[PDB]
Ligand SMILES: CO[C@H]1O[C@H](Cn2cc(CNC(=O)CCC(=O)N[C@@H]3O[C@H](CO)[C@H](O)[C@H](O)[C@H]3O)nn2)[C@@H](O)[C@H](O)[C@H]1O
Ligand SMILES: CO[C@H]1O[C@H](Cn2cc(CNC(=O)CCC(=O)N[C@@H]3O[C@H](CO)[C@H](O)[C@H](O)[C@H]3O)nn2)[C@@H](O)[C@H](O)[C@H]1O
Ligand SMILES: CO[C@H]1O[C@H](Cn2cc(CNC(=O)CCC(=O)N[C@@H]3O[C@H](CO)[C@H](O)[C@H](O)[C@H]3O)nn2)[C@@H](O)[C@H](O)[C@H]1O
């Protein structure tokens with residue numbers, strides 16, 4: 001079996017293992033800050049630099065994966081706490097969309113909300129143009145920020161949030177468990193055919209965005225990942 | 233929302249949070265040993281002492297949960313390494329079945345392999361009477377040790393195994409990720425309607441068993457759990 | 465180490481984690497209402513359902529704990545605002561005293577004011593028979609509602625009160641901080657040997673009572689708790 | 697009664713409510729970073745800018761207080777995780793000791809470990825020169841980093857730690873409860889006469905330090921405080 005495994009307890013500016021895109025910075029405490037608080041339509045993304053083989057064209061086999069990460073979103077004086085973080089999977093050549101308006105696109109899609117990715121968004125602003133639910137929510141996205149499915153959630157300013165994600169290749173099920181500050185767990189699951197929506201090799205990472213009036217602190221604190229593809 | 237959350241880094245005799253059933257002992261290192269290596273058809277089970285409300289007849293709501301645990305199975309001289317461990321959910325009055333033959337029943341079912349439980353088995357012996365697959369496997373069980381679904385797995389003697397389980401109430405999906413010593417992940421997922429198969433109040437725990445010729449060390453090293461039931 | 469931890473932001477009927485005794489009800493907003501406004505000598509108590517091992521006869525070790533809760537007492541028309549709430553610790557078999565007169569007993573003691581418990585009382589009526597100070601007070605109680613120590617306090621009708629309690633096992637000190645509506649803090653501390661006054665396994669909870677002409681709304685709004693006992 | 701109350705969910709370097717001393721910086725996420733990772737013998741301290749009257753020479757009354765704060769200590773590559781954070785109380789003219797060697801002094805004492813302060817240290821290095829216990833520990837300090845009392849503790853890299861402190865003026869008891877990431881609570885309490893050891897007016901704050909080969913990230917995330925002094 002072919003396995004990709006890594007663990008980040010902290011991050012650093014001169015680490016070849018991470019690809020930094022856009023407005024992302026690494027703070028002295030080791031956290032990744034995805035957006036720039038002084039820029040209009042700010043977009044920042046981080047990717048694990050090595051492409052992951054999620055499916056084999058020779059065997060037709062699809063990888064399963066287990067990943068856990070922690071983040072924090074914090075309000076900043078005078079701006080609307082927006083727009084949120086998305087944990088995404090995309091083709092290995094993925095870049096911030098050209099002429100990105102940031103905001104509700106979460107840095108992964110065009111103005112119409114379309115892109116080439118699979119993701120789990122932690123959305124803190126209700127965009128009517130992308131049929132967002134009225135409150136903060138966790139969503140399962142397939143090539144669109146108009147989520148396939150959402151669940152109500154609450155983004156608590158300054159709270160450390162823990163997420164665990166399981167992709168079971170046989171049932172094609174993406175399962176997500178989000179552990180909040182008040183101790184409650186929020187879950188969401190959806191069948192997503194990764195072999196049909198994504199290429200053979202992909203990149204995994206995080207993206208966040210803001211607008212002129214919607215800005216907040218978006219931090220990635222830690223990330224562990226294991227994927228296993230059967231080679232028989 | 234109603235949340236039940238606990239974490240065991242170690243275990244102790246006299247800990248009122250754990251109900252011990254059958255041949256269970258607590259080792260000096262804090263590990264739980266489920267079976268007795270010198271007894272024929274040995275059965276040992278540990279339960280979280282408090283009943284957990286997994287669903288409500290008033291709202292029709294069903295809880296989601298996130299649980300992680302670690303175990304170890306180790307071979308002993310001359311006996312067949314058998315029979316394995318099951319992580320199970322059962323009615324609050326659950327007891328080792330009367331006249332239990334241990335063995336392939338894993339301490340949760342009768343001789344015909346029927347019982348009242350939902351579980352995830354780490355099965356190290358192929359019982360033809362229970363239509364077991366030919367190799368070691370992880371299975372999802374619904375009122376029977378004749379699993380609804382299985383996935384091939386390998387039980388490595390002396391290896392610490394990590395398991396993460398997500399139950400998403402909306403899709404009724406039970407997703408399991410098993411992390412082995414060699415770093416590879418094994419996953420299995422199945423739609424199980426806990427509201428249809430179990431009572432409103434249940435107990436969560438572990439069970440293991442052996443036979444005359446089939447015995448091995450079955451250890452529970454740690455267990456964390458969080459369940460959340462929306463109250464409306 | 466052996467740790468018991470929980471957090472209630474709200475409460476619900478049928479939550480197997482809480483034992484309801486006497487006249488307790490759960491309101492639609494999630495608050496616990498301890499007494500029944502239409503009953504003479506009303507007594508209601510809520511206990512965390514799982515016993516807590518506060519000390520071990522094997523090692524001689526005693527647990528430390530940290531707990532925070534919020535309550536509200538509100539006046540009702542025609543009756544005297546009485547008698548108050550007590551946060552208490554008692555043997556695991558604890559029940560409302562048989563033939564309880566409620567009133568100044570706070571539902572934890574007999575007519576003479578004696579019982580088997582350790583508690584922190586928020587007393588709103590001056591019972592001369594229990595040597596109460598002349599005004600509202602917070603008291604530390606050891607097997608009696610004739611407090612070992614009191615501090616003057618003011619119970620404001622309809623005000624949400626926040627309490628934090630620390631029990632340091634090494635010094636045997638029970639420290640209490642009460643945050644009033646006017647913003648001021650009230651504190652009280654007393655050395656109490658829980659190993660000498662209580663059994664190894666105990667229950668934690670709240671109790672309130674009224675009399676014929678002494679009745680008021682007694683609400684428990686939230687409760688968080690953590691206890692840790694060092695093990696061999 | 698005379699009450700001082702404040703709450704910081706975040707901090708800003710351009711706010712007059714806080715005094716910054718030495719190598720302290722405010723990160724974009726709003727956290728306070730006390731030490732500079734690239735400097736030898738780095739010392740940084742933060743103080744609430746308004747002096748708080750803890751006792752009266754006219755009445756002889758002493759204030760009680762309740763304070764809660766959260767911090768994080770994180771390891772950095774190639775340097776020892778040292779030296780720790782101290783929550784301290786000191787005269788209103790308090791400054792980093794002249795020619796401070798940082799390290800085991802925690803930025804509050806001289807080379808011999810003596811200073812004018814009362815504090816609660818979260819010490820991560822065993823300095824034999826200050827009779828430190830062999831492991832990580834929480835200590836209660838009275839004019840010396842040779843603690844009056846200590847309790848074993850474990851500093852987990854990247855973990856958010858919650859602390860609650862109660863000072864009861866009647867018993868002169870300083871009680872501390874520390875909530876760890878593994879769920880366990882650690883407590884320590886000591887009788888400290890603030891009238892005898894400190895002036896009528898004091899400043900409250902935090903300090904941290906490093907050495908040549910002993911450096912780590914020291915962060916202050918939040919701080920709430922309430923003190924009340926009886927004026928009758
Ligand atoms: C209508 O213009 C008129 O006034 C303009 C003055 N103006 C207004 C604004 C602020 N409004 C806006 O930015 C509008 C766009 C908007 O609401 N985005 C959303 O902002 C969110 C946070 O609130 C989230 O981030 C969402 O994701 C994101 O979609 N900035 N400047 C003039 O310049 C213009 O000449 C004139 O004609
Ligand atoms: C066959 O009888 C004849 O010889 C007997 C002598 N014998 C044989 C045995 C051992 N066989 C057995 O125990 C048979 C049952 C068996 O295979 N269980 C499975 O053992 C596994 C480990 O290999 C797993 O644990 C499975 O889950 C479990 O089902 N023990 N004693 C006489 O006593 C009897 O008078 C006589 O007529
Ligand atoms: C004068 O007597 C004759 O007429 C009486 C008629 N009466 C009077 C009352 C009300 N007084 C009482 O209830 C007296 C007891 C009392 O003062 N409790 C305290 O009430 C507090 C609230 O004010 C707090 O709750 C304290 O904790 C609680 O101890 N109810 N009925 C008869 O009852 C009696 O048989 C008969 O001989």
Ligand SMILES: CO[C@H]1O[C@H](Cn2cc(CNC(=O)CCC(=O)N[C@@H]3O[C@H](CO)[C@H](O)[C@H](O)[C@H]3O)nn2)[C@@H](O)[C@H](O)[C@H]1O
Pocket residue numbers: 776778779798799800801821823906907908909910911
């Ligand atoms: C033998 O000496 C000769 O070579 C030295 C060269 N040297 C050695 C070192 C490293 N040792 C040291 O730094 C020694 C001091 C020390 O152990 N502090 C503690 O370090 C901790 C982290 O491990 C914590 O921070 C504690 O709080 C802090 O007290 N750095 N430089 C010269 O400098 C010296 O002139 C010369 O004669």
Ligand SMILES: [Ca+2]
Pocket residue numbers: 083104123124125126127132
């Ligand atoms: Ca949105």
Ligand SMILES: [Ca+2]
Pocket residue numbers: 315336355356357358359364
């Ligand atoms: Ca089997």
Ligand SMILES: [Ca+2]
Pocket residue numbers: 547568587588589590591596
């Ligand atoms: Ca009274």
Ligand SMILES: [Ca+2]
Pocket residue numbers: 779800819820821822823826828
């Ligand atoms: Ca030290």
Ligand SMILES: [Mn+2]
Pocket residue numbers: 121123132133137139145147
């Ligand atoms: Mn959305």
Ligand SMILES: [Mn+2]
Pocket residue numbers: 353355364365369371377379
């Ligand atoms: Mn099986």
Ligand SMILES: [Mn+2]
Pocket residue numbers: 585587596597601603609611
């Ligand atoms: Mn009283």
Ligand SMILES: [Mn+2]
Pocket residue numbers: 817819828829833835841843
């Ligand atoms: Mn020390």
